[PDB]
Ligand binder design. Structure first.
Ligand SMILES: [Ca+2]
Lengths: 318, 316
């Protein structure tokens, strides 16, 4: 078996690649060694990728925990998109860190499409990186990606509503909105049924319920109102109009990156795949959730590196 | 000697209006009365204006907290624009805008046909005054729908609220949606307010100085001072300050066009930004005519004057 380990601190994902062809994606929340070792039975090679950040390096703990769980057969994914040894190479922290899109993009360029745009929308961000002739050609830093529209800050859950726009069409009139932290995209998604109530993973702006009504109450606060001054149907239209700005913002950013290299194909994945295929309907859409299943779509980084590792192996031999 | 009491929830402003016209503004803030008495001697009449709401009725909690420190010489300001007795407040209209009291004052002592523009730490009120009558909408909702309420302030406005893209090194650049920088960072960097005028907390709970603001701004573009220069981060502030002024001006133009108004009376913490953004109009600065202390506590000053003008009027 080949494992794809994606440790992101809050939630570490594991992809098991079996030789009979099937795979399994696992989710974990939270001693790390004893934990990882339970997934070590029958493992010959493991690709390790750190999706987390400098939050509270500690990269020494993950490497040591992974090494005592899987041995020396560990390949960590570089910050450049290359596999390097657990030994020395990565044991020297820096160079280990990786983005949420690098492995995924490299995996797409070699297994799904050589010329396209990878659009990965999580809960907070949307990565939009171009792939040309089998090569990932996005900028390296987030700053350079923001300047190149390869990084857009719109997610399915944690995006403040006014980030989408400081004015919105309300009752046929362009209406100014509050800047206070009252509602987020999670509220929009719940109200428009783009996500079930069980997917509202982040804390609510007010600390109240995640239900459809509570969301509408939070939305109402964007126009300094409440479910008394306005109806639930009016607050619902607020969310629908914002959903429109949401898709529109995604499209223009993707169109812009597409124009650079004439790419006409997009490959979508992540929490916001439903939203993505709605906003990018004009392009030829290749859905990861349709081709590999929803779980892979929600844990692409771990799956991508496991496949890259397994392909390099079969390639090394053959 | 008249007292203009302005209670805004947990923060209150008290104006001392002496006979000869001399005045002294007092800013009070404390966790909750007793200190209301430290200013009761040598005081006859007093006006009361509560420019705050509730947020988890609750009016008696203070009107009685004053009646015990000012007897019944208190004249509370209505939400309809007129003064009324404590009795009418106790039994009921007592709570109101941060702008009504001020507007009324402007339409009698400053100008009858204009637009009052009050930019505080968080909001900007744009209420039109026509023929001496404040003709702005009632609720906040209606005002947001009529460019009479703009949610941008001198201090606590999340930067991306001004625009989710910004011009950087000549390119349309996307920005982070995370709470990293607020308008207070812009004001301090462009010296539109003093370092000591940075009231609200800082996003990263750090210094309110120049550099500390540039550090937070850099984060709006997923960067820091090791990746971009201080001049660069400052250009980010300037460009955002532009979108800021543009946003204010557009809202003021929509209202001006509706009422043919040509004059603007600006007041509030962000007066320096207001007179800059509204340079095209005929600008009447409250801070330049009455001093900064008045532009920072206009509500309490207005009711102080209004009451006086009515007392010297009930004598006819
Ligand atoms: Ca480059």
């Amino acid at each position: 078996m080949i494992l794809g380990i994606d440790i992101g601190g809050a939630n570490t994902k594991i992809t098991e690649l079996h030789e009979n062809g099937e795979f399994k994606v696992h989710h974990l929340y939270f001693n790390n060694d004893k934990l990882a070792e339970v997934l070590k039975t029958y493992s010959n090679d493991v690709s390790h990728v750190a999706l987390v950040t400098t939050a509270e390096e500690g990269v020494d703990n993950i490497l040591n925990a992974a090494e005592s769980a899987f041995g020396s057969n560990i390949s960590v994914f570089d910050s450049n998109g290359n596999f390097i040894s657990l030994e020395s190479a990565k044991t020297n922290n820096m160079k280990v860190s990786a983005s949420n899109w690098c492995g995924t993009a490299k995996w797409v360029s070699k297994n799904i499409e050589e010329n396209c745009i990878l659009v990965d929308m999580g809960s907070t961000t949307t990565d939009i990186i171009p792939i040309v002739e089998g090569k990932v050609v996005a900028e390296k830093t987030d700053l350079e990606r923001l300047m190149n529209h390869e990084l857009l800050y719109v997610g399915t859950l944690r995006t403040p509503i006014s980030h989408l726009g400081n004015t919105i069409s309300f009752k046929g009139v362009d209406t100014n909105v509050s800047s206070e932290y009252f509602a987020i995209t999670a509220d929009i998604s719940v109200v428009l049924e783009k996500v079930t109530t069980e997917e509202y993973t982040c804390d609510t702006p007010d600390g109240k319920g995640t239900d459809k009504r509570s969301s509408l109450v939070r939305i109402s606060k964007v126009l300094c109102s409440d479910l008394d001054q306005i109806s639930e149907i009016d607050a619902e239209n607020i969310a629908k109009n914002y959903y429109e700005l949401w898709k529109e913002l995604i499209l223009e950013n993707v169109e812009n990156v597409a124009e650079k290299y004439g790419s006409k194909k997009v490959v979508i994945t992540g929490l916001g795949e439903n939203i993505l295929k709605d906003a990018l309907a004009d392009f030829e859409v290749i859905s990861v959730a349709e081709r590999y299943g929803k779980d892979v779509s929600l844990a692409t980084p771990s799956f991508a590196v496991a496949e890259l590792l397994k392909n390099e192996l079969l390639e090394h031999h053959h």
